[PDB]
Model the fold of this input.
Amino acid sequence: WLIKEELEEMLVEKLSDLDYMQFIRLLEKLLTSQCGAAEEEFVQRFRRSVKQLIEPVQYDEQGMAFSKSEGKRKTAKAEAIVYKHGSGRIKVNGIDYQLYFPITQDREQLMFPFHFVDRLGKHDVTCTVSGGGRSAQAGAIRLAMAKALCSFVTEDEVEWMRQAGLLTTDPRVRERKKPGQEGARRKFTWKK
Amino acid sequence: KHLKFIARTVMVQEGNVESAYRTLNRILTMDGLIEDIKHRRYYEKPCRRRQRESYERCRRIYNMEMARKINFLMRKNRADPWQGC
Done:
């Protein structure tokens, strides 16, 4: 159902909350009364509507079939290229992933997308990442790899990855420090 | 001077002594004997007794009138037949 503001805009008038509730209850009674199309269109006048796009497969000079995508996390931006056929090799900035990511947590984060759809060792990945720290770069590469791999898994697997959070871009970024307080939220020591 | 075990006597039924005691207590309450027993512990002065009796009569009349009014108006409490108008 449209909100009270939408109803007021439609009727170019001002209505109270109780009037809106009365009208909504009347509309619900109309819907539950096995109303025909002549009334279903009337209902749809007051109805308001509430999937991830996938990049297409491309081809390179070498003849391999691949997809390319990108992602970001905090202040790090990464671009990933995933080939349809590979051997699990991932090279970040021209460096092998186990050398560019000595931390095991980052390597686990990189493994997470392919492991979720059960495709470890079935692809080859080349990533270019810039900015942020080790974990931000790992997260950006993870998001880019998942977005690119969406071009090779089935739609059901795409929906499963979306439900697993592999495709949502993490909006959590550093909050700015404000004047009069130590940090983003840390106030100064309240004297007495 | 009266015969014993006739007044305020309740026979127990299949040994439910608790139930028999509750029945006897209810009988005493309904007959007002408990009220008299507890109010005769201390002397209630006649003016206080008259005030209490008048207040009790007024409260009973008011409660009966309120209950009758609520019962009479309860019929209107049905579902709204003219919803939207």
